[PDB]
Amino acid sequence: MKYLPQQDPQVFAAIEQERKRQHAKIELIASENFVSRAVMEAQGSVLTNKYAQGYPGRRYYGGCEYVDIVEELARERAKQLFGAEHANVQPHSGAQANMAVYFTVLEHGDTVLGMNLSHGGHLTHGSPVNFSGVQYNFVAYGVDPETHVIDYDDVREKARLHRPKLIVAAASAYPRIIDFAKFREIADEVGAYLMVDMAHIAGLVAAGLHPNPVPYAHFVTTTTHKTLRGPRGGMILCQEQFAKQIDKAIFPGIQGGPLMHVIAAKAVAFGEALQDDFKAYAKRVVDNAKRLASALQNEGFTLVSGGTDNHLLLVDLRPQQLTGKTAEKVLDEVGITVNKNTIPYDPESPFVTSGIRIGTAAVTTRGFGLEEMDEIAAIIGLVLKNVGSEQALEEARQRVAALTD
Amino acid sequence: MKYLPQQDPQVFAAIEQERKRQHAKIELIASENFVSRAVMEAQGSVLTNKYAQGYPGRRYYGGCEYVDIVEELARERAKQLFGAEHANVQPHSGAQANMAVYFTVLEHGDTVLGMNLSHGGHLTHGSPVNFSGVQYNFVAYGVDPETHVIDYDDVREKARLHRPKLIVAAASAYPRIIDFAKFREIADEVGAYLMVDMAHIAGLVAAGLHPNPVPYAHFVTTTTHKTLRGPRGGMILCQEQFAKQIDKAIFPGIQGGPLMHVIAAKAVAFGEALQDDFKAYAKRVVDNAKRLASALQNEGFTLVSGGTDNHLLLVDLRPQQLTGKTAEKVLDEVGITVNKNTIPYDPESPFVTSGIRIGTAAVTTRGFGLEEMDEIAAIIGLVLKNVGSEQALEEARQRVAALTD
Secondary structure, eight states, X not given: OOSHHHHOHHHHHHHHHHHHHHHHSEEOOTTOOOOOHHHHHHHTSGGGGOOOOEETXXXXXXXXXXXXXXXXXXXXXXXXXXXXXXXXXXXXXXXHHHHHHHHXXXXXXXXXXXXXXXXXXXXXXXXXXXXXXXXXXXXXXXXXXXXXXXXXXHHHHHHHHHOOSEEEEOOSXXXXXXXXXXXXXXHHHHTOEEEEEOGGGHHHHHTTSSOOSTTTOSEEEEESSGGGOOOSOEEEEEOGGGHHXXXXXXXXXXXXXXXXXXXXHHHHHHHHHTSHHHHHHHHHHHHHHHHHXXXXXXXXXXXXXXXXXXXXXXXXOGGGTOOHHHHHHHHHHHTEEOEEEOOTTOSSOTTTOSEEEEEOHHHXXXXXOHHHHXXXXXXXXXXXXXXXXXXXXXXXXXXXXXXXX | OOSHHHHOHHHHHHHHHHHHHHHHSXXXXXXXXOOOHHHHHHHTSGGGGOOOOEETTEESXXXXXXXHHHHHHHXXXXXXXXXXXXXXXXXXXXXXXXXXXXXXXXXXXXXXXXXXXXXXXXXXXXXXXXXHHHHSEEEEEOBOXXXXXXXXXXXXXHHHHHOOSEEEEOOSSOOSOOOHHHHHHHHHHHTOEEEEEOGGGHHHHHTTSSOOSTTTOSEEEEESSGGGOOOSOEEEEEOGGGXXXXXXXXXXXXXXXXXXXXXXXXXXXXXXXXXHHHHHHHHHHHHHHHHHHHHHHXXXXXXXXXXXXXXXXXEEOGGGTOOHHHHHHHHHHHTEEXXXXXXXXXXXXTTTOSEEEEEOHXXXXXXXXXXXHHHHHHHHHHHHTOTTOHHHHHHHHHHHHHHHO
């Protein structure tokens, strides 16, 4: 940076602390990642100066010839990545991407079936304090209480009883592969649309490491950050037949002008994801998650669903008589960043929890491998098995420092 | 830029074209501006890597100590600028800022009174193709057909007849000062909340050149771009009594995690707006708009409301027997960027229009003064009075080139 340190010492000092913190800590929050310098340069571009309400070649304002090239690069690269017929790269966020799909196919008060929030479902999949739950009538399907795998007979029974206009699949804390084919079969039985929110797993999908929802879902929403390792934002994919309606839902339906500089950053990230080395990166993410899961089980930890098929894992801390809140706090003390997370059939409130959620996308981006996974699990064991020992915690702090350099 | 040109030649080539276009053209779109290099550096920062769902010191995720400093700098600087008791700097956009206020105080189907869209009202103030018009029952007040000034007796009669739960004031194409005191008196008479969307005029308000809606409105929404000259995004201001509800409407109500890098950019822009030279800048904007209005009238043009009190003006092209669409296209041919805009009681559709909208914020940022305003008006006269003369248009093209260098 050149001008910010001179113009705004206060903002610069705080950014610099944040930059140093990102390096110093072990980031295990499952939705986090580190973007390339190219992605950040695109976001820091003069494209913030351009109003581009509408769509490429169908703008409401002149002078869009070049930002049209940027948006089309983003759309076409997204279509190539996911094999989708249409892309809308304008959503400001995952939340707005979901909001727009809901606005497209639902009327106020319509019934929607989504994954139980306590079992891994997202806030925008029916929380009563979220627009989703307030605006629509959400019902929930659950995971098996033993296997913690989505109970597809429960999805079906709920769909047949409640007759939802829309079924939502996807999750913020589900460590196994989701069967989109079964979701579509159920959707078809009851005449419902299928929406898949692939925010967490989008990078894995792009690398062919998770089945692709695009052939099964009427609408696929996603963030461009998380496993996809792009800038913060949203995106909708759909078949040609829904394209005009989806575009109209984003604008003029729920947003105004798009963030063209962020759209440029999306294009960049999609370019990166189309490369072979992103495929290798994504495989290391899943390889690291399995390895981390195995090493944690070696420490004596119980994992929700007994392991992982993707980038993330959930520790059930009940055997250790610890809450997720307690675990999250003590790990913070040693430089390991997790979040407390409800587990299926959690006896504790969402504010306390019996679990912690862990993902490997961020540490994998940093170059961490299988050896590092074994060491992270060993540090987590040392800490959670010795919560009252300041000596244990200091040793952990030093081992964390050894990992981050 | 260093890494983008190597990583993504296609995206870089298009950004570079856009950068060169911004310099080469005369930007008269009233909502446009050019941000500082400090603002862009903040947006291009590693803060894109941080998930910070919740609010400063009340986050749902750890590691937010530094991004909390950034967000509080933004909130406190906004509060100082506008004399507000509370600020929410998380809205992704002006649209989402409005959406959140609506979500706070209204139920589906509630009546809302806003400015007639054909008279300068915004898309999110009741368009039937926008969430606002679909979700709520919007009624409209108008401007006087002669003076083009808001008819405050019409605001009152509409409010008394329709009994709105909320009254919205503010506009995208209204060139006179809005009387917020009268809006509040009407709101109080009928027991309605008052929302002021100050997106266009926020920089002028900050510089004390437009009356401040904060003391009169229950809720003030705004963009951080436009006259405020910040990054693209939204903000809500309100009194302490509404703070918790507004914050909850943004999250968990209508968004998820905020864009922390954009929030950093908001802080930077607010820092700039608190400086004396921003006050001088804002005065030049309004001085330039009056001067431009006067010079256009000198060319024989008719202006909506007969001039301007702010940054923007609307040309009524009916005397020249031209549509806004025609004018917009021919000005584009010579390097002058305007938008066609409906005028009050426009005989033409919103897609054709009888007007063009012009603002001075962008050219003022570039250093243009009164002399440049006289020349811009002279070029516009040459072009619109000679639409069929390629020689006139070439002369205009060269005079535009002389202005931009």
